[PDB]
Each structure stands twice: as structure tokens, then as C-alpha cells.
Symmetry: C3
């Protein structure tokens, strides 16, 4: 339940990390 929903959370935070780095790269390659 809980430990799982924390893992589901680490999932989306890993994404969110990657997405912000991509958005920052793309601003610089614009």
C-alpha cells in the first residue's frame, strides 16, 4: 500500500527530474 505508493512517487519524481533537464537543454538549444 504505502511503501508501494512511495515507490510510485519516486517513479514520477525521477521523470519530473528528467523533464526539467530536457526543458532546460531545449531552451539553451533554442
Amino acid at each position: 500500500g504505502e511503501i508501494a505508493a512511495i515507490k510510485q512517487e519516486i517513479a514520477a519524481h525521477k521523470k519530473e527530474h528528467a523533464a526539467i533537464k530536457w526543458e532546460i537543454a531545449a531552451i539553451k538549444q533554442g
Copy 2:
């Protein structure tokens, strides 16, 4: 107490999400 301060936390993270999207938009409309 705890469940409340977690909700107080989801509050500020929602903001923080919006603020970063606004800062990224504004860089592109600059």
C-alpha cells in the same frame, strides 16, 4: 497533525509545479 502537514506540503508542491512552468514559459516568451 501529520496528515495535515502532508496536505500543507502537497499545497506548496502544486505551487512550485506551476511556478516552474511559468518561469519556463516566460523564458520562451522572452
Copy 3:
């Protein structure tokens, strides 16, 4: 253990906050 690893976490989130502000400043001073 837990309270400590939460504090270790607040550590890295403070950083992460500063790092994103620096990356945004530097895009604007580019």
C-alpha cells in the same frame, strides 16, 4: 534512521531548489 533520512532528503531538496534557480538565472544572463 527515518527522521534522519528525511533530514538527508530536505538537504538535497534545498540544493535542488537552489540549482534550478541558478540554472534559470544563467539562462536569462545568457
